[PDB]
Amino acid sequence: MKAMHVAQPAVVLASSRGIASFVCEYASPGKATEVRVTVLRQADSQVTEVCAATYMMGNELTFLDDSICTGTSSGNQVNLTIQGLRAMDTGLYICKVELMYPPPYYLGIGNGTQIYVIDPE
Amino acid sequence: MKAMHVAQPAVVLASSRGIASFVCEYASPGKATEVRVTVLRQADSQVTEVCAATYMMGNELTFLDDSICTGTSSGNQVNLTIQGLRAMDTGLYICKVELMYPPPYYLGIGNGTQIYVIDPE
């Protein structure tokens, strides 16, 4: 596991419809085979998992049935939406982003060593 | 698969005991979980596999039972020996080196977005 910075807006005001949107950006190396986003909520020191989705870099996010969250990946971004919010749902919403890549594999082929063996008697 | 250069001596003279030794160097990225060396022989255009061994970077090589080949890995090197050679065993001996690494995995944890939700009436 290598650490990765994730940036997101410090504060967001949910609309009167109770829809809140924010972006979580990160500095990835390249095209991750997998990318898994998880939103956690902190209030009263208690941390809960609000939602989780997995997808391939570029391909669209999709959360579990009737999720609070909607999502859209565009490059080194995930654009989260969270709906149905009410007053008591105020708190700190944290992005956890996992990127997974294929195992490196190197093949080297040498030019050859001509081995000469003596025929004695 | 990424290509990798492998260098080895152009010519080697087997001793009167029929023991021939050569080094196959390569430019690897780092500590490969796996490293697999394979020696191929070319004569009359025909290519045969003379021997194969697998090991971890640093840890010692060991070939199949009663192998022609003996081996020792030291950094970015494999030091091959080949014994029991006779005249007809003259030919081009090629190093094939495979390096395998673990799948990259990045975890990013955001600082959080404080979401404020309005209590209406």
UniProtKB/Swiss-Prot annotation, chains A, B:
Ranges of residues in domain Ig-like V-type: 5-106
Extracellular topological intervals: 2-121
Expression by tissue: Widely expressed with highest levels in lymphoid tissues. Detected in activated T-cells where expression levels are 30- to 50-fold less than CD28, the stimulatory coreceptor, on the cell surface following activation.
UniProt-annotated location(s): Cell membrane
Gene Ontology biological process terms, A to Z: adaptive immune response; B cell receptor signaling pathway; DNA damage response; immune response; negative regulation of B cell proliferation; negative regulation of regulatory T cell differentiation; negative regulation of T cell proliferation; positive regulation of apoptotic process
Record annotation: effect of changing residue 109 to A/D: Strongly reduced interaction with CD80, CD86 and ICOSLG
Effect of residue 105 to A/D: Strongly reduced interaction with CD80, CD86 and ICOSLG
Primary location group: membrane
Region (Homodimerization): 12-16, 116-121
GO cellular component assignments: clathrin-coated endocytic vesicle; external side of plasma membrane; Golgi apparatus; perinuclear region of cytoplasm; plasma membrane; protein complex involved in cell adhesion
Effect of residue 36 to A/D: Strongly reduced interaction with CD80, CD86 and ICOSLG
Glycosylation sites: 79, 111
Entry keywords, A to Z: Adaptive immunity, Cell membrane, Diabetes mellitus, Disease variant, Disulfide bond, Glycoprotein, Immunity, Immunoglobulin domain, Membrane, Pharmaceutical, Phosphoprotein, Signal, Systemic lupus erythematosus, Transmembrane, Transmembrane helix
Subunit structure: Homodimer; disulfide-linked. Binds to CD80/B7-1 and CD86/B7.2. Interacts with ICOSLG.
Disease with which this protein is associated in UniProt: Systemic lupus erythematosus: A chronic, relapsing, inflammatory, and often febrile multisystemic disorder of connective tissue, characterized principally by involvement of the skin, joints, kidneys and serosal membranes. It is of unknown etiology, but is thought to represent a failure of the regulatory mechanisms of the autoimmune system. The disease is marked by a wide range of system dysfunctions, an elevated erythrocyte sedimentation rate, and the formation of LE cells in the blood or bone marrow. Genetic variations in CTLA4 may influence susceptibility to Graves disease, an autoimmune disorder associated with overactivity of the thyroid gland and hyperthyroidism.
Further facts: The therapeutic antibody Ipilimumab competes for the binding site of the endogenous ligands CD80/B7-1, CD86/B7-2 and ICOSLG.
Described function: Inhibitory receptor acting as a major negative regulator of T-cell responses. The affinity of CTLA4 for its natural B7 family ligands, CD80 and CD86, is considerably stronger than the affinity of their cognate stimulatory coreceptor CD28.
Protein name (record): Cytotoxic T-lymphocyte protein 4
